Amino acid sequence: MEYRELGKTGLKVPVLSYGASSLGGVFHSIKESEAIQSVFTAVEHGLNFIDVSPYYGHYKAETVLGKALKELPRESFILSTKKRAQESVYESMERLNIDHIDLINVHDNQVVNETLPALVELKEKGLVGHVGITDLQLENLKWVIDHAAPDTVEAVLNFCHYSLNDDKLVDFLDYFDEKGVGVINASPFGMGLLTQRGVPEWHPAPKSLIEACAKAAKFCKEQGYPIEKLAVQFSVSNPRIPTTLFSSAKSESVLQNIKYIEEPIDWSLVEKVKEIIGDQQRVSWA
Amino acid sequence: MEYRELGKTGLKVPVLSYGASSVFHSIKESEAIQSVFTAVEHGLNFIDVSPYYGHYKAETVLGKALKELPRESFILSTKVGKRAQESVYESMERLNIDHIDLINVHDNQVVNETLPALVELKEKGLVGHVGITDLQLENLKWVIDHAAPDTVEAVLNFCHYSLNDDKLVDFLDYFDEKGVGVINASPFGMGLLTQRGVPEWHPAPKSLIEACAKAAKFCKEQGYPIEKLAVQFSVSNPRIPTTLFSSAKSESVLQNIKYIEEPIDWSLVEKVKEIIGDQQRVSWA
Secondary structure (H helix, E strand, O other): OOEEOOOOOOEEEEEEEEOOOOOOOOOOHHHHHHHHHHHHHHHHOOOOOOHHHHHHHOOHHHHHHHHHOOOOOOOOOEEOOOOHHHHHHHHHHHHHOOOOOOOEEOOOOOOOOOOOHHHHHHHHHEEEEEEEOOOOOOOHHHHHHHHHHOOOEEEEEEOOOOOOOOOOOOHHHHHHHHOOOEEEOOOOOOOOOOOOOOOOOOOOOHHHHHHHHHHHHHHHHHOOOOOOHHHHHHHOOOOOOEEEEEEOOOOHHHHHHHHHHHHHOOHHHHHHHHHOOOOOOOOOOO | EEEEEOOOOEEEOOOOOOOOOOOHHHHHHHHHHHHHHHHHOOOOOOOOOOOOOHHHHHHHHHHHHHHHHHHOOOOOOOOOOOOOHHHHHHHHHOOOOOOEEEEEOOOOOOOHHHHHHHHHHHHHEEEEEEEEEOOHHHHHHHHHHOOOOOOOEEEEEOOOOOOOOOHHHHHHHHHHHHEEEEEEOOOOOOOOOOOOOOOOOOOOHHHHHHHHHHHHHHHOOOOOOHHHHHHHHHHOOOOOOEEEEOOOHHHHHHHHHHOOOOOOOHHHHHHHHHHOOOOOOOOOO
């Protein structure tokens, strides 16, 4: 298992990161029951870095996850999660029964002046290791880092922009280097596009991107090289992206993606399907 | 296009009803609002807003969008000491509706505190009818038995009247005895009876997954999608007033409407129940 420093953060994070797939909805019990075993498996097999944002919100799930994490040693895992935002961090820290969060990041106006300062105060207190931000659009990330105070934002998290099908994050990597920001990729598979089963029912991806990615998955199938294996291989394949956050419930998926990323990537196959995904490279569906 | 009566409640629900589904929840949101508009346009009055209760921003958008449709043209339902009454109040407040048609309860002794409270809210005329929601029919039976009489008007249940599971059948005589309307849900087994297949999180055992995949590719070779047969079967029983499917895009809603309005091939249902053999009613809860 390979590790990267998360920018100027000091945390050695594994090139893949477990994101604890969404638990809300009916059958939530099954999903969180499996997610606990997945946390254990990811830690036992190399993933320091667990994000539990989907647990941010559910009293009982968060508390028995606090039990589960109390089963694990102090330095055995790095944990990150999502005016009154101070009390929110305090509240959910109590529910997790952890004594301090390794990194807090803001979901989503001028978060620049209200939430981020409170989290900076919290980092000075000793209860939060580092601060970061989460968003969909890289222009928004640039905006908020720009108008914030210097060296406030230590990490950024962003979705579907370093894949076989989307390449945008490159354009911003330099910028992050210039302001000392660790980069966290997420959704390596394009949320179904780089899957061999296909794309979920809610996915609004245009018909063209859908067809390009389905044909790439078919070519991968015919070459005996699963498209998801290639996608997860590729999202952790950039030395400037410290880590990528994949979401799953069953521990089998954690172990499969571990086995994938630890196996050598086929750069010729990357060239091939990046070609087959034609005009649809960096086509957006947000 | 076909309507039945929800037990004795006097609400006329279509055989198929829309249960709008679950980062990336805003995109699902907008699509789901368009989907409820499409469904109400095509006759699917029964609208369950349970996944919106919990996010102020999420319930507000459907409240404001739904204000654009006539009140008598749709029947609405949602999820829920007497904190339940305050929950109903606030749900109406963000949905900007003066009357909820059906109010349900998820999940121990809700028979003496929660259900009497919701009954009181019905007495006042804010809610029309009161029901319960569970994955286990035994738990539904317990609640109905131990509750005050004629309290439980609706019972919602998942993955127990479909091509692979029909454990709801055994309880239908009971539900008729009690005066309880039945709302089926998840007619696809949450991916089993789909051509694409099962999500990663699904716990269903190897044998069930394989039998359903074989039935699926058989349906494919026959030119008759497994999803069409699934939704047709689920709505095919007259003692089950309505079946609730959770979709996001409006195209799925239109597909399912066209599917239920097509006749069902019972020979195909039996050829599929032969592929789903010892796996019928195998639980994964």
